[PDB]
Amino acid sequence: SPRNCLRFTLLGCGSSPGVPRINGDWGKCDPKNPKNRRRRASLLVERYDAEGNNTVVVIDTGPDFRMQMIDSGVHMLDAAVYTHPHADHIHGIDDLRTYVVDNGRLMDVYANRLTRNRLYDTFGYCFETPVGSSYPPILSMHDIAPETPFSIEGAGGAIRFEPFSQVHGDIESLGFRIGSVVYCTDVSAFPEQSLQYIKDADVLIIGALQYRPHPSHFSLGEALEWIEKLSPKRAILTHMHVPLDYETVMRETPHHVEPGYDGLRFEVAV
């Protein structure tokens, strides 16, 4: 059992349609390598104390959330933190309901104004019972904003997040630093003020969609450029689309850089 650590699990490392796409398209990925089967992008963040008690926080609840949590072996949850309101990051939100019953209290969720306002539109019944329904709400909303740290409490002690702004095509997404681990998905550019949060990470988890440019995400080359500038000790690529084959990308990248895979898990000192 883990003790005296943060533990991170890469729940999903795929692009918005997953790998393979729903039509069975693997792109250039080797279908025989299980590491190329990719769920939608999400990160589990845990803190364990000396006795193995844990605080558990998920970053994003996409459509794969339920299977991600089942397969993680972690059976409790303290909070959900959201990057931005795109389908692949939010459409598994209803599956928070079981934990509300287990915990006997609303699930604390964390989101910026843009994300929160879209969740209210799309998933109002999670916040407020609509006319003609008997379903109680399940979520308790908390604001977050770039450059304002926030902490989530739980049985393993507090987990402190440092959110920051990312450009994501035509909208803003959030990245987060947790200790010396940084999570940057759905990003096409980093604003100058965000650099302090992303440099000198022990582990930088950074989105690299594909080889060719895309308006909303870094290409592999752009991600590598950023990794060279930010000098993380280790980098892990995420939000990888069907052009990016695990073995191939492993070869093409520096030794301290690797494509992620679903279930990739590591512990770090608190």
Ligand X SMILES: Nc1nc2c(ncn2[C@@H]2O[C@H](COP(=O)(O)O)[C@@H](O)[C@H]2O)c(=O)[nH]1
Binding positions for AMP: 87, 94, 97, 125, 217
CB 37 → a copy of itself: shortest distance, Å?
9
Residue 235 binding K ion, by CB under 5 A: no
* Torsion region of 4: left, alpha or beta (phi above 0 gives left; psi -120 to 50 gives alpha): left
Q: Taking contact as CB under 5 A, which single stretch among the options 12-20, 34-42, 244-252, 260-268 is the one that binds K ion?
A: 244-252
Among 87, 189, 195, 270, interactor with a copy of itself by CB under 8 A: 87
Beta carbon nearer to Mn ion, 41 or 264: 41
Residue 16 binding K ion, by CB under 5 A: no
Which residue numbers belong to the known binding site?
A: 84, 86-89, 91, 94, 97, 125, 168, 186, 217, 239
Among 1, 32, 50, 121, interactor with a copy of itself by CB under 8 A: 121
Site for Mn ion in 122-151 (CB under 5 A): none
Name the residues that contact ligand X, by CB under 6 A. Answer: 15-16, 85-88, 90, 94, 97, 125, 130, 133, 135, 186, 216
